[PDB]
Amino acid sequence: DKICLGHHAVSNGTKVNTLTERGVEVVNATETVERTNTPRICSKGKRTVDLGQCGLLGTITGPPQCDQFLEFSADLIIERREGSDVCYPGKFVNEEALRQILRESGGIDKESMGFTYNGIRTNGVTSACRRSGSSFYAEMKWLLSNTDNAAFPQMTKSYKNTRESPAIIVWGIHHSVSTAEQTKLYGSGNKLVTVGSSNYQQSFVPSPGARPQVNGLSGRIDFHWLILNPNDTVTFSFNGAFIAPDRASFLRGKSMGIQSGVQVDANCEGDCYHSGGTIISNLPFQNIDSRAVGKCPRYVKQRSLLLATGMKNVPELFGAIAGFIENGWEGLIDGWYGFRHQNAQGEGTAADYKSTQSAIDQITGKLNRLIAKTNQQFKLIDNEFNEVEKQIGNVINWTRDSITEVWSYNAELLVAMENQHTIDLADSEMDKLYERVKRQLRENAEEDGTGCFEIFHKCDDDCMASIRNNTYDHRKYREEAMQN
Amino acid sequence: DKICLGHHAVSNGTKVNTLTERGVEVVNATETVERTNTPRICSKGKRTVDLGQCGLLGTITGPPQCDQFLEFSADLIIERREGSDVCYPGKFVNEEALRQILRESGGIDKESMGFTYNGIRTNGVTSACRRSGSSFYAEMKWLLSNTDNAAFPQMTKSYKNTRESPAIIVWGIHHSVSTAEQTKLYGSGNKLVTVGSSNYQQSFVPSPGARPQVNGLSGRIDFHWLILNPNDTVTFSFNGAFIAPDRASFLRGKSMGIQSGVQVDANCEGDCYHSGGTIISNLPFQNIDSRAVGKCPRYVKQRSLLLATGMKNVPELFGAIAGFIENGWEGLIDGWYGFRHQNAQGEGTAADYKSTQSAIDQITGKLNRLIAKTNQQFKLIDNEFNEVEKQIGNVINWTRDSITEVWSYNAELLVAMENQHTIDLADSEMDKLYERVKRQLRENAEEDGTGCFEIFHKCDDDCMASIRNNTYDHRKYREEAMQN
Amino acid sequence: DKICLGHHAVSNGTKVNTLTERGVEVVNATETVERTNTPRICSKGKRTVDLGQCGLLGTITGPPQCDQFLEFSADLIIERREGSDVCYPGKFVNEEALRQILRESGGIDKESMGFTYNGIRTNGVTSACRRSGSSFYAEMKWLLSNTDNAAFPQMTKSYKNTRESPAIIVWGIHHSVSTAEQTKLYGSGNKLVTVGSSNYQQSFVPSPGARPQVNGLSGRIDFHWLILNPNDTVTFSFNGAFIAPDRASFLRGKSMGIQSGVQVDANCEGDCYHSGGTIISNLPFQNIDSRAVGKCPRYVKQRSLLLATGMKNVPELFGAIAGFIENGWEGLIDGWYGFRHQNAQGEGTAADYKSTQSAIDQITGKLNRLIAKTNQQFKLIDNEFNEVEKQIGNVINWTRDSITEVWSYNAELLVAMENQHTIDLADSEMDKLYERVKRQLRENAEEDGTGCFEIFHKCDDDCMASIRNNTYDHRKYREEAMQN
Ligand SMILES: *[C@@H]1O[C@H](CO)[C@@H](O)[C@H](O)[C@H]1NC(C)=O
Ligand SMILES: *[C@@H]1O[C@H](CO)[C@@H](O)[C@H](O)[C@H]1NC(C)=O
Ligand SMILES: *[C@@H]1O[C@H](CO)[C@@H](O)[C@H](O)[C@H]1NC(C)=O
Ligand SMILES: *[C@@H]1O[C@H](CO)[C@@H](O)[C@H](O)[C@H]1NC(C)=O
Ligand SMILES: *[C@@H]1O[C@H](CO)[C@@H](O)[C@H](O)[C@H]1NC(C)=O
Ligand SMILES: *[C@@H]1O[C@H](CO)[C@@H](O)[C@H](O)[C@H]1NC(C)=O
Ligand SMILES: *[C@@H]1O[C@H](CO)[C@@H](O)[C@H](O)[C@H]1NC(C)=O
Ligand SMILES: *[C@@H]1O[C@H](CO)[C@@H](O)[C@H](O)[C@H]1NC(C)=O
Ligand SMILES: *[C@@H]1O[C@H](CO)[C@@H](O)[C@H](O)[C@H]1NC(C)=O
């Protein structure tokens, strides 16, 4: 005598945020922000150099903790906390512009320069750079006088680039503890070290003075560096206090460099590296670390953003889900939408296939659109272990904190618009399934108001099956149902 | 005999911009861009130091206009137009990196260094730094010779950091007017000032020469500064022309620094500061000043962006507001939607409560979403009064003029999408109120085409009240209204 | 006996991307990303200086390839590949901060300084700067000794700014090949060049040494530059090796500077300049060159983004286009929506004017909104021909590659939302045209299910015309059509 219709519901829903409400209960939802990392470095398919105690700048000068790393070759370069560049006390000049070159180099190739020295002692060593006894750096030479006070002749040496890749030359200038020991090593008079190339003329000078003792010594060595282009030349003229190189340095290819504190994993495989592990996920957004390098998801401020993947949960815009149909059915477990007739034969519930699959195919089309990959690869511009310069370091924090505010706005605006459209999408599929059964069942039944029809003739289980499969012929029943 | 329905309207509407039209008349609207500022500095709950004539860098050297500000402590630091750092003519080196430290410091703490000087005159004063007679800076010492030409012995002093906060040490180097007066103060020979720490070795040198007269004098003093870390040391060796410090400098906490031109207000309270006052508002966007610091609304290019908070105004997507209902009622003053019957009893207008409150509750849910607070605090990276460096100043203007173009695009796209959905929201509430009265009044009435029903029986004021309260029983009237 | 209705279709559609599907066939579409450039520089209405072999920094020193360009004046400045700044071998100091000043200057004005020199030879020339025989730069003076070895007196000169615009003064310092030729030109002793102003005290020094031969010579000239403010002064004291200026330099106005490789076109007119031509288009997005200057469209990563400007193509959300109306008509060529009756008179198709023009007027309102102009003018911050500094050059590439990712996200999100709304817009105009004909034709006809009505009386071509023009009086036909 009557044929009703409704939708499915579950007892425990999930609260998502829509464009016009907060906390809307929905049948099913999906997290869209990654929060769990793998506490390892996943490097399947990448040859990997773990430096350890070797600093990143010890591969171009060669302290005794960088003997096995002078001519490395890898695609992933991992620096550590304890990495030191020097053994005799000193530092570089413009050390952060040089580390950004060597992280993307993919290795380094050393070739000899070939300087010959005469009337001069070259094997002056130090007590700090110890391999077996006392030694010095592995690729440079401590040039000092032969007689302890007499003289140091003025020298002039030259080198010429012959390859097609740019070179990295590094030299050193020695600042003694006093003038009383600068004479004890070199001689007298002013000391000049003129460094000349096509684009370089600086003429450095030592500066003896009292210093606090860094690990036993009171002198310093400052290392400088320039870059040759092909078919160019370099000239070093000096009359004392010079730390001459022996080998040049070249590049190999492309790589990346990360700064980590965890181990190296050879079976796992991921391409998003931060200082605490590896972010391996397909989600577009993440809330783990804002300084991650590689192909990574974007950093948001919010920790949880749920995406609705079902209709609204109504347990027991178009006005069907909690419109005139006031509750959902918990017995309907086959699909999303269904029929429940009631006649002289008894009761019986079905489920509709063409309307359930018309709603699932549009929800899955939204999930394939959001689960996508970023093709943009981000490098590493700041240094975690030691302190880039203060004025440009405030520009980097200002820019990163402004792009984070933009992406965390596009995150919650995308989701709240995507759940507003999803709830309205499954609301329209119930209003089209109501109006198909209405205009099929033309003049033989009336409407109740609760989303249920009341048919004016004897329509048994064979007859009610003619309405579900869209084969109801109203013309056979027309002349009898107009009596009622 | 008939029962109509319509919506309310006002004579003077407001033109807003939608996603598909320009200038749509709506019942009520709301401005969403702030344009009025308070011409004061609102600082209730913040301890505040107004510097005035004291420069921001005079608190570490102590000219006579910074006597009361040597050991200040505040949370809001206000600099002025007339602030000068020095009294003897000179300047600093890297003066903009140092002002960015002191604005966020929250005060400064001076502790003594304790250098003793012997065989040497220390109380050399100048005629420009006048407190009572002639004096010098308040925390530094003018070291010069005792006999007017004879000699200046080579000196060496040292200091050691003992606290846990970093220090700010400042020294000075004196460049005389000539060599004839450099001998008249110090002696003869070359002058070296070697400054040594764990990370610093520079060995500065004076440079006598003719200068134009800045306020009476023709010499200069250049001030330099380094930062100690805890358990580190500094050594100053010199044989002349040195301006030695007496006290160190420490930090206290967290603050902000603004550059203003207006007064200080102690009763008002706001947290968005620009150079002309205080932006106090709840609106998300503002068009006052693009260089405001603190928790501020975002800067847009547009001066007016109206947000619709009512239905479309039709005076005398779903097709009800100016669809088949062609005009709005100006007599309906109770709610937004209503009924107006007409029968043998006369006339009478009502208003519907369940449909009016279903539209207001969704408009107010949009206003609570847009009226929100920014939690991100912006500092001050450029200097209005004096001229940051030209190459990095062009990077700051390029970045700020690109984020302004992004937010003024998200401003007018949010509003035009928000008014497109609002007009469609109040259009659907009229189509649901029409179709509820339709299927309630099942076979007893027909439709006109103007949104009005014409009932086929005698339905008086008691009977018409049964339709407004949703209690109309059609079964009692069915067998008589089918005669017509 | 029956009156149907449908929409128009074409055989070949166009596949666009919507918010919920990929590749949706639509009647007509529109490209929204520009890809074709004009391989010229369009400069109608702009006075234009093509430099050619003159470098941009040769207009302030005057080598012999910049004789006609010393006092230029233009609004568009075009540099070339072969532009060289110097004739004697050397370079500038901070050459990139100075080129950014001169590109926006709009010309340059030279005024004389007026130094007189006595007891000294001034006309020392070089063999590299050749105009007729041997000469030197056009606005500077090579000051050297009179007797080949004897002496060079110490000199002191001064200049004072008298205008209201800032000056550009440039001087030079000569670094000889050795000390044996520095004596052969100047004299003996140390050489100082003290440069003093209100904000400048540097006291430079020459540096003789062996250099590789750049085009015949082994010495260098380094050029330096400062800026005067009005009522300020400059003093040059020296005892040798100085390259003194003769004329100052001023600015004229506002301009832009491009770096191109193509010719200059005087009849074309465009305002977006890159290194390969001119982007002339009205489209908001472009995929030609990401380093374009002027009023340009924004750079996206995608090469094609089609915008739908018609309904969905169904050849032979509201459920009319491929809802219950299952195909489109290819005979309907007048408008977008129409009628096709069928009776005893025969057949006949019409087209509806009020529904076709109600859909076109809303599509055109979207095209006027997207085709708009950017008012923001972008300058040129990096240098294509020669290599800005490595650390700040990595900041510029990092920022540009992040704004490109934002705009190419707002590009495909705007289009996919704009085509989702367009298809739903022309779907609702068919559902309003179906329900207008329905409630007009009140109780005289029934519905089929295919979007066609079947009328219960004899309604000929004059009668069917009463339905298309909205003049059908159902009351005249009511008492006869209720018999059926
Ligand atoms: C609900 O969504 C989740 C995704 O979070 C999915 O794994 C699951 O299969 C869905 N269905 C049910 C019945 O949980
Ligand atoms: C930049 O922000 C980081 C926080 O990740 C902080 O450690 C660092 O000190 C900041 N740098 C500057 C110069 O403020
Ligand atoms: C209903 O449709 C199915 C499949 O189209 C068909 O097998 C069946 O005979 C139809 N009729 C009834 C009464 O089930
Ligand atoms: C209209 O909106 C304004 C907000 O601008 C509000 O103050 C006012 O109460 C609203 N109603 C009327 C009747 O003006
Ligand atoms: C940056 O823009 C401001 C405008 O607020 C201007 O005063 C300043 O001179 C600009 N700086 C540079 C280096 O162009
Ligand atoms: C209408 O509804 C109200 C409240 O539900 C009730 O008090 C009243 O009796 C109802 N009937 C009429 C005829 O007003
Ligand atoms: C289709 O759109 C294009 C724009 O690409 C327009 O030029 C054309 O006139 C439109 N109509 C037809 C029938 O091609
Ligand atoms: C910046 O990117 C450009 C690509 O247009 C490249 O030519 C240039 O070398 C890059 N600069 C640096 C410092 O990486
Ligand atoms: C239909 O409308 C047109 C214009 O409104 C009118 O000229 C015509 O007489 C009307 N009637 C018929 C039967 O065409």
Author numbering:
A (entry chain A), B (entry chain A), C (entry chain A): 2 to 317, 328 to 495
Text of the article:
The hemagglutinin (HA) protein of the influenza virus is responsible for receptor engagement and is, therefore, one of the major targets for studying the virus-neutralizing mechanism and screening neutralizing antibodies (nAbs) against the virus. After binding to the host cell receptor and being internalized into the endosome, the HA protein of the influenza virus is cleaved into HA1 and HA2, which are covalently linked by a disulfide bond. Subsequently, it undergoes a low-pH-induced, irreversible conformational change that is required for viral entry through membrane fusion. We resolved the cryo-electron microscopy (cryo-EM) structures of H7N9 hemagglutinin (HA) alone and in complex with the nAb antigen-binding fragments (Fabs) and identified the HA head-located epitope for each nAb, thereby revealing the molecular basis and key residues that determine the differences in these nAbs in neutralizing H7N9 viruses.
To explore the structural basis of the neutralizing capacity of these nAbs, we determined the cryo-EM structures of the SD008 HA trimer alone and in complex with the Fab of each nAb. To determine the cryo-EM structure of the SD008 HA trimer, we collected 61,557 particles from 623 movies and obtained a map with an overall resolution of 3.1 Å at a 0.143 Fourier shell correlation (FSC), which we then used to build the atomic model of the HA. Interestingly, we identified three N-linked glycans at positions N38, N411, and N483. Sequence analysis showed that these sites are completely conserved among all available H7N9 strains, suggesting that these glycosylation modifications may be important to the biological characteristics of H7N9 viruses.
